[PDB]
C-alpha cells in the first residue's frame, strides 16, 4: 500500500504545516501537524477542557463506531518549546492520503497548553519519530508509520515541504518526479528516538564550504534551523545590522536586508537554503526588525534541522531495519 497527502502552511510565514487526517467511522477529518521530532498522535477532542478549545476541529470518539477506549492508558507530553498536552487514549481507524491503519492509538487531549489553544489551525499532532518516544502509559503505543510499515510497498515516508506553498507527505514510495538529481543517503542514530544524523558542514552565501560534523535531528515539527552558536554567528555576521537580541529571544536583522543563502552538507552533497527562506518577518506588526530563521541551538542541547532546512529538500525517512535519511535538491 501507499498514501499521499498534501501538507499546507498554516500561515504566511510557514510557521507549521497541516495535513488532513481521517479518524474514525464515519471519517472525522482533522488537520494535524506531522512531527518527525515526536511520537504521539494526539487530537483536540470532545474531552478537551472547553476553555482550552478555540476554533479547532475536535475528534468525538462517541460518534465513531470503530473507536474503543484503551482502558487505563494515559499520555502526557512536553515539547522542546515548552508547549504541552495530556489525556487518555482510544484506538480507532486512521487514514492519511488513502493509507489506512486500523487499531491506531489516538490520544485524546483532556488538557492542552495555551500555545495549542491559541493556534486555531492545528487540530493535533501526528508523530513520526521512533515509537520509543511515545508517551502512552502503562503500555507504550506505536506511531502511525510503525503501524503502517509492514503493509507499505517500501518502509519509507517522504517530506516535501513547500516554501510559502503546499507540499506533500508520501508513505510507502519515493516519487522520482519530486526532486532533481540524486538522493544522498546518510546514517541515522535512533539512540535518542529521533531521526538523528550528522551533516558534513556548511557554507554561508557564496562563501567556502566548511567541513565540520554537525549532529542534529530532522524535525518537521520545528519551524526554524537551530545550529551551534559558532555556525549561526558566522551566518549573521554576513548581514549588516544583524544582532542577537536577548529581549526578542534570538537573532534579528533589519527588514531592509537581503539575506544570504545557507548551505548544509549531506555526505558529499549540498542542500542550499535560499536567503528568503530565512526571513520570518517583522518581530511585531509594523516593526522594521525581522526575525531570523537560523538560530542558536545553545541551551537546547541538540541541533535541529527544522522546516527552514527541510523545505529546501526532498527528504526520505527510510524506516528499514537500519534506518537512514535521504536528501535531494528539488
Ligand atoms: C507557539 C507554538 C508552538 C506550537 C507547537 O505546535 N509546538 C511544537 C514544537 C515541537 N514539536 C511539535 C509542536 C504551537 C501550536 O504554537
Give the residue from 208, 191, 209 showing the smallest Cα distance to 200: 209
Q: Are residues 207 and 310 in the same domain?
A: yes
How many domains does the chain contain in total? 2
| Core vs surface per residue 122-145: b (16+ CB within 10 A) or e | bbbbbbbbbbebbbbeeeebbbbb
Q: Whose CA is nearest to atom 11 of ligand 1?
A: 221
Q: Whose CA is nearest to atom 13 of ligand 1?
A: 221
Ligand 1 binding pocket (C-beta < 6 A) is 33, 35, 37-38, 79-81, 83, 115-116, 119, 122, 125, 221-222
240 CA from centroid of ligand 1 (Å): 31
Range of the structural domain that residue 121 is part of: 5-174
Q: Are residues 160 and 202 in the same domain?
A: no
Q: Are residues 213 and 74 in the same domain?
A: no
| Core vs surface per residue 46-66: b (16+ CB within 10 A) or e | ebbeeebbeebbbbebeebeb
Please report the atom of ligand 1 found closest to the CA of residue 83: 7
Q: Are residues 98 and 246 in the same domain?
A: no
Q: Are residues 306 and 228 in the same domain?
A: yes
CA gap 277, 287 in Å, rounded: 19
59 CA from centroid of ligand 1 (Å): 19
109 CA from centroid of ligand 1 (Å): 15
Q: Are residues 266 and 308 in the same domain?
A: yes
Please report the atom of ligand 1 found closest to the CA of residue 37: 11
Strand order through the sheet with 289-292: 243-245, 250-254, 289-292, 279-282
Q: Which of 43, 79, 125 for a ligand 1 pocket mutation test, highest count of atoms within 8 Å of Cβ?
A: 79
Q: Are residues 127 and 151 in the same domain?
A: yes
Q: Are residues 274 and 310 in the same domain?
A: yes
Of 174, 191, 206, at which residue does a domain stop? Answer: 174
- Kindly state the cell numbers that stand for 85: 498536552
Q: The CATH number of the domain where 225 resides is what?
A: 2.40.70.10
Q: Are residues 110 and 202 in the same domain?
A: no
Of 121, 150, 174, at which residue does a domain stop? Answer: 174
Give the residue from 217, 177, 162, 159 showing the smallest Cα distance to 193: 217
Q: Are residues 132 and 182 in the same domain?
A: no
Q: Whose CA is nearest to atom 12 of ligand 1?
A: 221
285 CA from centroid of ligand 1 (Å): 21
Of 130, 158, 174, at which residue does a domain stop? Answer: 174
Q: Are residues 155 and 223 in the same domain?
A: no
If DSSP states are collapsed to H, E and C, what string results for the chain?
A: CCEEEEEEECCCCCCCEEEEEEECCCCEEEEEEEECCCCCEEECECCCCHHHCCCCCCECHHHCCCCEEEEEEEEEEECCCCCEEEEEEEEEEEEECCEEEEEEEEEEEEEECHHHHHCCCCCEEEECCCHHHCCCECCCCCCHHHHHHHHCCCCEEEEECCCCCCEEEEECCCCCCCCCCCCEEEECECCCCCCEEEEEEEEECCCCCEEEEEEEEECCCCCCEEECHHHHHHHHCCCCCCEEECCCCEEEEECCCCCCCEEEEECCEEEEECHHHHEEEECCCCCCEEEECEEECCCCCCEEECHHHHCCCEEEEECCCCCEEEEECC
Q: Are residues 193 and 295 in the same domain?
A: yes
Q: Which residues are catalytic?
A: 35, 199
Amino acid at each position: 500500500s501507499t498514501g499521499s497527502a498534501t501538507t499546507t502552511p498554516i500561515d504566511s510565514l510557514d510557521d507549521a504545516y497541516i495535513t488532513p487526517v481521517q479518524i474514525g467511522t464515519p471519517a472525522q477529518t482533522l488537520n494535524l501537524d506531522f512531527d518527525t521530532g515526536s511520537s504521539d498522535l494526539w487530537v483536540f477532542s470532545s474531552e478537551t477542557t472547553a476553555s482550552e478549545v478555540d476554533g479547532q476541529t475536535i475528534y468525538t470518539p462517541s460518534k465513531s463506531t470503530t473507536a474503543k477506549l484503551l482502558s487505563g492508558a494515559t499520555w502526557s507530553i512536553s515539547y522542546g518549546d515548552g508547549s504541552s498536552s495530556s489525556g487518555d487514549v482510544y484506538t480507532d481507524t486512521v487514514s492519511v492520503g488513502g493509507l489506512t491503519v486500523t487499531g491506531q492509538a489516538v490520544e485524546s487531549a483532556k488538557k492542552v497548553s495555551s500555545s495549542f489553544t491559541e493556534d486555531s489551525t492545528i487540530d493535533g499532532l501526528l508523530g513520526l519519530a521512533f515509537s520509543t518516544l511515545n508517551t502512552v502509559s502503562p503500555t507504550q503505543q506505536k506511531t502511525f508509520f510503525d503501524n503502517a510499515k509492514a503493509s507499505l510497498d517500501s518502509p519509507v515516508f517522504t517530506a516535501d515541504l513547500g516554501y510559502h506553498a503546499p507540499g506533500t507527505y508520501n508513505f510507502g514510495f519515493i516519487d522520482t518526479t519530486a526532486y532533481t538529481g540524486s538522493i544522498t543517503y546518510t546514517a541515522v542514530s535512533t539512540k535518542q528516538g529521533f531521526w538523528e544524523w550528522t551533516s558534513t558542514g556548511y557554507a554561508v552565501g557564496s562563501g567556502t564550504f566548511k567541513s565540520t560534523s554537525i549532529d542534529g535531528i530532522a524535525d518537521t515539527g520545528t519551524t526554524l534551523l537551530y545550529l551551534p552558536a559558532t555556525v549561526v554567528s558566522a551566518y549573521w555576521a554576513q548581514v549588516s545590522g544583524a544582532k542577537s537580541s536577548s529581549s526578542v529571544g534570538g537573532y534579528v536583522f533589519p527588514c531592509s536586508a537581503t539575506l544570504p543563502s545557507f548551505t548544509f552538507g549531506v555526505g558529499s552533497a549540498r542542500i542550499v537554503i535560499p536567503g528568503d527562506y530565512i526571513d520570518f518577518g517583522p518581530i511585531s506588526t509594523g516593526s522594521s526588525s525581522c526575525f531570523g530563521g537560523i538560530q542558536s541551538s545553545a541551551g537546547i542541547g541538540i541541533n535541529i534541522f527544522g522546516d527552514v532546512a527541510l523545505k529546501a529538500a526532498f527528504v526520505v525517512f527510510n524506516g528499514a531495519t537500519t534506518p537512514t535519511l535521504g536528501f535531494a535538491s528539488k
